[PDB]
Amino acid sequence: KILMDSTHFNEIRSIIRSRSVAWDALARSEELSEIDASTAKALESILVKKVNGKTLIPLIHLLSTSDNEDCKKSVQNLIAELLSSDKYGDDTVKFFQEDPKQLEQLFDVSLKGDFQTVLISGFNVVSLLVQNGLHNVKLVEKLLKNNNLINILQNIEQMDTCYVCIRLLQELAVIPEYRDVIWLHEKKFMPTLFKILQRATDHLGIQLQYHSLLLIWLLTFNPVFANELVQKYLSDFLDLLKLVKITIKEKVSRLCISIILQCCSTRVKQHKKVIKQLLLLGNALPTVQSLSERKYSDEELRQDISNLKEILENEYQELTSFDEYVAELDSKLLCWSPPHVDNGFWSDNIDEFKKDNYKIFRQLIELLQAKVRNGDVNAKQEKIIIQVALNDITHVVELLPESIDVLDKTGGKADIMELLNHSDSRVKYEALKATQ
């Protein structure tokens, strides 16, 4: 663990060491022979008080069979300590690399027992990180399937554990293979990562938010990853900007702005369209204008914010509310939409979603069907969608009623009746307009 200085690392080390047991008792219990017990004792006297070296290998072997006391999380306790303690962990990773036969066993040594070792597994099997050549791409790929890392990093209640896991993941990005493994994990961990920034939008919280921002930036450094995420976490693109705007920490804001700019980097596929959509929907352009007006002492953060502002200006130089309308139609789980603002844009929008023949609006038909399926439930998003889809249908039908037939044949009358059937407030509130 290169970053053991972090308070989370100190807590992990303290938790791991709080359950240490003597090797003499293990020898008395017949868990290991005299030589193995002596080696375990030497490893313990090295890690936390020559010591170690040839020892701590038999300690790991004993902990493989022993399932309690120091044998439960001895590897995690040794890793959490700094390399100054006889190079424990730091030299242990290199020694294991020199002996691949037990390497897998060492990788399996960590991530056992309670969270004290589960969280330290990311800092136990890969305590050396991607440096020194101890690990490999295959090891990271295999370890990315462990659920202990997800439980630790994404633990909403365990703020300290989540911050420690996020920091370890961010540090692991040194090697491109480790970065790819981290991106693969993020492809499924998206909920927790996005929620971290969402909570950061308004002292373990700051550290956790910074770790999440670092992980997001590291994953987003690859243009392909950012382009793929734009299709699943497009709202997160502006959520990160909002979190940075609320966040006062200079380094955290710099990281968030850098991640946002990377999302808009020319390398990212469809960079221009993505930037334009972000500016139009997430108010990234007004936010960048405010950041330019605002002042900060972080020179790197200032440069990142200026680059983001330039990207936003370029995106808005060819922006239109039609992109926002398309995004809203893609969402179909909201209460109101941009076109409801006034009668200006809708004047064209009435024939925009329909493609002048309702053909392009069939996607709007599917969105309304999904919103009606959700409408039968009382969820806030459900009621919002029930109202919004019906209001948009009424607005579209008010002009050029030909497409109404397509809606009528597609269950438009039945959908309107069901919206106002019963147990609905906004659904009926919009079905009234639809049927009027």
Partner: peptide, 24 residues
């Protein structure tokens, strides 16, 4: 910090690809 780490390959590999190999 990490910006320079990315720029390392962003320049060393990209420069040759876009200005050396294309001259072949």
């Amino acid at each position: 910090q990490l910006k320079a780490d990315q720029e390392y390959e962003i320049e060393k590999t990209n420069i040759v690809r876009n200005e050396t190999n294309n001259i072949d």
